[PDB]
Amino acid sequence: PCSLNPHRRSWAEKQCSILKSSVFSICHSKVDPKPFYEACVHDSCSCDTGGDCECFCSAVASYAQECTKEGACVFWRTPDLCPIFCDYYNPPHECEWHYEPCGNRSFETCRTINGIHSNISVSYLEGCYPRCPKDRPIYEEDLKKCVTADKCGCYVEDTHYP
Amino acid sequence: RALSCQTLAAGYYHVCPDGLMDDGRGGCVVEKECPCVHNNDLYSSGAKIKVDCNTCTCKRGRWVCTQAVCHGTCSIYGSGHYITFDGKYYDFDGHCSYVAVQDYCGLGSFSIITENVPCGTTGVTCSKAIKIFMGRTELKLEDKHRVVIQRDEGHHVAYTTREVGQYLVVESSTGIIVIWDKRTTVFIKLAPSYKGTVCGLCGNFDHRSNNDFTTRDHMVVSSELDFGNSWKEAPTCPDVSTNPEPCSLNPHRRSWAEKQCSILKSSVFSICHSKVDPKPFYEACVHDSCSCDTGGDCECFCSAVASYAQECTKEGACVFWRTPDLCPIFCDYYNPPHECEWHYEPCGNRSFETCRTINGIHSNISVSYLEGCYPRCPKDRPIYEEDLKKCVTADKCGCYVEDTHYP
Amino acid sequence: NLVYLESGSPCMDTCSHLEVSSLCEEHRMDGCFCPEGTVYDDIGDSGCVPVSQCHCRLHGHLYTPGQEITNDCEQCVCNAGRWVCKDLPCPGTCALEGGSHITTFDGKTYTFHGDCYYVLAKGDHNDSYALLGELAPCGSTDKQTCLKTVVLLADKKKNAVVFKSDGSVLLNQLQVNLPHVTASFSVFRPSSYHIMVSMAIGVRLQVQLAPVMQLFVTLDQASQGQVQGLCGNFNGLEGDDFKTASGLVEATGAGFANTWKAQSTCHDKLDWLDDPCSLNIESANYAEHWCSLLKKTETPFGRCHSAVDPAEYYKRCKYDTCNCQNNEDCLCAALSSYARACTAKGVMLWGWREHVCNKDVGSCPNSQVFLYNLTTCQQTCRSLSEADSHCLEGFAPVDGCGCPDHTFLDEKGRCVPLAKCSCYGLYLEAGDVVRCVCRDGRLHC
Amino acid sequence: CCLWSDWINEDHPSSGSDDGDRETFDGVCGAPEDIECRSVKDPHLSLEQHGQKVQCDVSVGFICKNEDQFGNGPFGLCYDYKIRVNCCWP
Amino acid sequence: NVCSTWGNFHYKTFDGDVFRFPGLCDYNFASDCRGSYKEFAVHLKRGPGQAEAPAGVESILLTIKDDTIYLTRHLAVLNGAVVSTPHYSPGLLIEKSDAYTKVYSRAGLTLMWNREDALMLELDTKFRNHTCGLCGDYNGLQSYSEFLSDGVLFSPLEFGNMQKINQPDVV
Numbered sequence A: 001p002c003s004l005n006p007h008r009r010s011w012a013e014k015q016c017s018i019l020k021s022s023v024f025s026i027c028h029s030k031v032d033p034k035p036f037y038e039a040c041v042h043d044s045c046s047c048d049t050g051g052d053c054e055c056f057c058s059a060v061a062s063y064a065q066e067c068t069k070e071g072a073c074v075f076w077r078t079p080d081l082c083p084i085f086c087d088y089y090n091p092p093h094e095c096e097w098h099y100e101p102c103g104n105r106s107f108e109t110c111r112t113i114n115g116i117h118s119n120i121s122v123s124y125l126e127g128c129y130p131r132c133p134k135d136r137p138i139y140e141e142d143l144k145k146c147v148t149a150d151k152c153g154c155y156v157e158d159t160h161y162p
Numbered sequence B: 001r002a003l004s005c006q007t008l009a010a011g012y013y014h015v016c017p018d019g020l021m022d023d024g025r026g027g028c029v030v031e032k033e034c035p036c037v038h039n040n041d042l043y044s045s046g047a048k049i050k051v052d053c054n055t056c057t058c059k060r061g062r063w064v065c066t067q068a069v070c071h072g073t074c075s076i077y078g079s080g081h082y083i084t085f086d087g088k089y090y091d092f093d094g095h096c097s098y099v100a101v102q103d104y105c106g107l108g109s110f111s112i113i114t115e116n117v118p119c120g121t122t123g124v125t126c127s128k129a130i131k132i133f134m135g136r137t138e139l140k141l142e143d144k145h146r147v148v149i150q151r152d153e154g155h156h157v158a159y160t161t162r163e164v165g166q167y168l169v170v171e172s173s174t175g176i177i178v179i180w181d182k183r184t185t186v187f188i189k190l191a192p193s194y195k196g197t198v199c200g201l202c203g204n205f206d207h208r209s210n211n212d213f214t215t216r217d218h219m220v221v222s223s224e225l226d227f228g229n230s231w232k233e234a235p236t237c238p239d240v241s242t243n244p245e246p247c248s249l250n251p252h253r254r255s256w257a258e259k260q261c262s263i264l265k266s267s268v269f270s271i272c273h274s275k276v277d278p279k280p281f282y283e284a285c286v287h288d289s290c291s292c293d294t295g296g297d298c299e300c301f302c303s304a305v306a307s308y309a310q311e312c313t314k315e316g317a318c319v320f321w322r323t324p325d326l327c328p329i330f331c332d333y334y335n336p337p338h339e340c341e342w343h344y345e346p347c348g349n350r351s352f353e354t355c356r357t358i359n360g361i362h363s364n365i366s367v368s369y370l371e372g373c374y375p376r377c378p379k380d381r382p383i384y385e386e387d388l389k390k391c392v393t394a395d396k397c398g399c400y401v402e403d404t405h406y407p
Numbered sequence C: 001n002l003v004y005l006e007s008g009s010p011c012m013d014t015c016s017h018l019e020v021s022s023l024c025e026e027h028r029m030d031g032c033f034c035p036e037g038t039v040y041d042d043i044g045d046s047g048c049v050p051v052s053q054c055h056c057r058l059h060g061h062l063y064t065p066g067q068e069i070t071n072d073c074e075q076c077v078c079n080a081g082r083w084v085c086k087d088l089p090c091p092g093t094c095a096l097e098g099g100s101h102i103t104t105f106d107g108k109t110y111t112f113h114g115d116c117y118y119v120l121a122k123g124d125h126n127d128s129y130a131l132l133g134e135l136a137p138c139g140s141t142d143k144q145t146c147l148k149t150v151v152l153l154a155d156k157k158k159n160a161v162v163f164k165s166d167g168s169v170l171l172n173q174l175q176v177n178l179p180h181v182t183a184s185f186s187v188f189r190p191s192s193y194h195i196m197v198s199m200a201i202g203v204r205l206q207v208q209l210a211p212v213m214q215l216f217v218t219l220d221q222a223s224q225g226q227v228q229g230l231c232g233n234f235n236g237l238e239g240d241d242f243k244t245a246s247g248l249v250e251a252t253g254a255g256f257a258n259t260w261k262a263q264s265t266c267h268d269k270l271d272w273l274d275d276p277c278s279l280n281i282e283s284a285n286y287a288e289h290w291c292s293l294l295k296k297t298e299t300p301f302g303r304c305h306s307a308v309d310p311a312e313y314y315k316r317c318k319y320d321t322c323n324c325q326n327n328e329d330c331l332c333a334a335l336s337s338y339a340r341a342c343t344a345k346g347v348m349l350w351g352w353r354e355h356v357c358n359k360d361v362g363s364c365p366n367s368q369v370f371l372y373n374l375t376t377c378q379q380t381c382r383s384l385s386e387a388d389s390h391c392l393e394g395f396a397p398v399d400g401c402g403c404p405d406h407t408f409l410d411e412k413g414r415c416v417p418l419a420k421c422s423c424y425g426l427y428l429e430a431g432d433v434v435r436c437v438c439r440d441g442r443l444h445c
Numbered sequence D: 001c002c003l004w005s006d007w008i009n010e011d012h013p014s015s016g017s018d019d020g021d022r023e024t025f026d027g028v029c030g031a032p033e034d035i036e037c038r039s040v041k042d043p044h045l046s047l048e049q050h051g052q053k054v055q056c057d058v059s060v061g062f063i064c065k066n067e068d069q070f071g072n073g074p075f076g077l078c079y080d081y082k083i084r085v086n087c088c089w090p
Numbered sequence E: 001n002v003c004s005t006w007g008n009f010h011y012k013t014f015d016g017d018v019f020r021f022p023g024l025c026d027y028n029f030a031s032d033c034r035g036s037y038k039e040f041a042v043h044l045k046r047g048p049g050q051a052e053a054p055a056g057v058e059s060i061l062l063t064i065k066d067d068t069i070y071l072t073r074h075l076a077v078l079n080g081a082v083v084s085t086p087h088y089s090p091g092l093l094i095e096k097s098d099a100y101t102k103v104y105s106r107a108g109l110t111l112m113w114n115r116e117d118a119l120m121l122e123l124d125t126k127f128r129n130h131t132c133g134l135c136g137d138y139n140g141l142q143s144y145s146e147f148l149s150d151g152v153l154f155s156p157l158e159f160g161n162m163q164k165i166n167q168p169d170v171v
Ligand SMILES: *[C@@H]1O[C@H](CO)[C@@H](O[C@@H]2O[C@H](CO)[C@@H](O)[C@H](O)[C@H]2NC(C)=O)[C@H](O)[C@H]1NC(C)=O
Pocket: B158, B160, B171, B172, B173, B174, B175, B362, B363, B364
């Protein structure tokens, strides 16, 4: 792709050089950045029909996910580079949804209050996570609402029933 | 004879009895208590609306408005789009330095220069630097920051630089205001003392728009390309001989551009459809997205959708259009680690106490329509000190001498 | 006379860009410069000439300092590097083209799609005139509208003249015969698809009848800021054309124009944020192939590209072609409006109808041919009998069936030559003696 | 020794400036013996099963013109074509 | 339910109504006449007249909400480009057997056509009271609003001529 699009190479190799830079320098001894640099440049030279800043931000979050999984939490997003919008989900100005950059928080859902647990550890996945208050500290997942431990739901045949 | 309170001044050329007439709201109304219509809304008698600096009143089915003269605004935005002080829209894709506004027009006190470079491969150009000359002071807006160049010895025309939402705002004591979104969009505002005393690519600000294409040698031409090629700064810069067509030189980028930019003509912006015409903002967005073909085209898109939503706030319609999938914004970056004070205010309308305005210092225009992240300082330090983005107690903020923050 | 110096500033005033040194962000070095006064000649090729010898320029030609020129609406003289321009009187034209494309007197083109009688222009005093016009749906949907009836209320609003869309000019609900010349106005018909109306107030009308009905209105510049309607107020600014008759400027064209309904029982119309070339896939390839001829230079439309800039006629040509139900009548109307607005700036397109809209060129009668410069005063020898009463200069030439450079039109049928034309009283033949022998055009009386 | 060449797709309908699709054999061979004329995205169709009007001979190569495809389908564009040439070597 | 045409110009609406319309020009087979936003449109184009006994279809034109599918006897064209079948884009499946050509859309549309004469369409129950093609409306009522609109009973020959599409070059 970077040979069939010579004009997109200079942008791609400058944006994707975050991975080999001092931002990710805690992960440089734990995950090899070299096949993630070459994937990011291959991906950004070829999103030539529209929306190439989505092809970029996914390739930088494939590397930062391995870094969390190996023990290095890196905070790489800024308001100019791949921003994330986690206060969209808040009840109007009560601030509970925070961006947790490396997932590592174990709160009570309404599955795990009734014994239901998974078989792997998915506590390294980037995203927006709740921090439910102390008058309803149980996160019901199928509606993205913090509820009291009594009034959450049913969960039969993989369907939420209020 | 069946009058209707909308056909008063028509003439009745070609139900209610004699006397009474319809109002468009319901039953028959006398002529004295007749309502008023403005932008598809119906306002009863004695209602008050504002129009940009003035106040109106529905008196007898007509509007009675005050006569003050407002500030005038030039726009430069996207891949070479202009709106003059008298409201004339045109396109010019030049690659040189151009006079935007000056009063050295045939001796002078200011000059504002724009530096237009090619952004893409199709031949369209966009604005990437602003130089402000005020007397002998030279500012320059470049690389997301303001730089002071050549501060004179003892004159030092009083200017002020602060950051309001996502934009940077320079103001002067002489009446010159420059608003800049740190990429390509510029808004120049002049006080109404500059009527008919400026020139450049923004016109001459005399409330008459069939002479805005006056060239540097004082000749009104009809071409966009003879006018714009006469305000270049260097004589060795080339002439633009045609305007490019980006969605014809990039046929593969047209389907993405016309699908993303169709938010403007959709039900999301349907409160603003009767107050701002979306049609020249749809055509700018498609022209901008077909031509960002070297990298970063979701920045060319989100700026064109925020140029339309800014006019909507300015006219009275706050629209919340951003989602986590469409043009996200990251305002909890600025919070002290998990104390949540910086909120995204989608239409700016909040008046809190800074540490300038606690000491009387106020601006001359209303910048409370600018999108961005705004503080909501707590009740143990409710004073926002702007040059460090910190909420402070009213005593310990700073000094503000010679446009520099001293702690 | 570029003398060499050391330590002088590189910011030179150059006879077009004067006053450079007030914005000079450079220090000084050596090189070849100018003397104390004597700015450098940029436009010509000489050296540091005096300031009052600067030759001007205007799209090419190197005008000497003192040579005047006659431009669009102003005349200008080359002073020392700059032009000194002075205004000349020039009219203004409101156009109502397609079914719904209003162009006001001050630019400002907009689309409306109404269903009512609307006030297009009227005089503000108490009486003077009022020009109406019906914009009703002609096709299937409401977005397929057409002009149907032009109504003129003149002579202190006691005379109503109606222009139906089949000819059929009728005064006060009664048919009239054309020509009809009166004291205050006159109505002509030179080419059977064209009606020309002139008024003594300063109002001129041209009603087009084929392929679709269109209207062109012309005012003098004495009536500047003294009209109201759907054509604006004609004051130089186009930001206040959407200013209603009760105060404030509206935002959209369909919100402004619902205030100019001539009937109270008409419904309110609204804009339409769609394009017709996406709603119809079969019409959008036919629209692309034929409206692209306005932009390519092999056709007889590239001659106008130096004056008219077809980029906005191309956008309307695709609009009307994809929208209306008879797509060729909207193509040929939008191609005949670029050719109309190009003859208004000198460049006349002789013979643009040879590949595109020639379904009526060869259908002229036996003696008369298809013309592109048919005017009112190419009429019969009965027009030569008056010869100063009804000529009505000031209009635009139109394209229809007519006779060549000689052999003026007879009383009926073919156009015989000048010797045996007629003697117009009843038009007698070329064998009658009064003592005035019937002769070529004039009479020996 | 009369081996066939490779497939040559050096032009596109949605790119270039020749207003269509034209594939020539320069840089490979001088005077061919045979030419094969197929499409990219469905290569078993003959030239009579595409319905577009082209010329594809051993003299000059392949020519498709977008103006010739008016009124044929609803889209009016050339398809994407590719060619082989047959040349004999001593 | 199912609309269908086959044979020697036989039709069958979504609510029964088997008739026979020997029109040869270009027609609307089914369409979304909701008014606000049209979801789909299926345009049928009968041939030049094959013979007395059979009745072929020359081409089928189909537009689903963003994109246009053009089916002929030999090739299938999506947005001006020839597609290799099967085609798996995430709202649209276009596959070609030895007998039929199927188009499966997420909008609740399924078209299936052997490449000579038989054409059938299947819509879900979302489009009730909205369809307006030659397949009738989709209200469930036998012959109610297709043939008896304002009391006047339309013959099947004048019901079919109402469904025609005007092409801007050919009479
Ligand atoms: C708003 O405009 C006023 C009016 O010009 C500015 O007041 C001027 O301030 C300068 C020095 O700051 C004085 O030299 C002038 O005499 C003032 N004008 C008048 C009429 O008194 C004011 O500075 C502007 N606001 C800001 C924030 O600069």
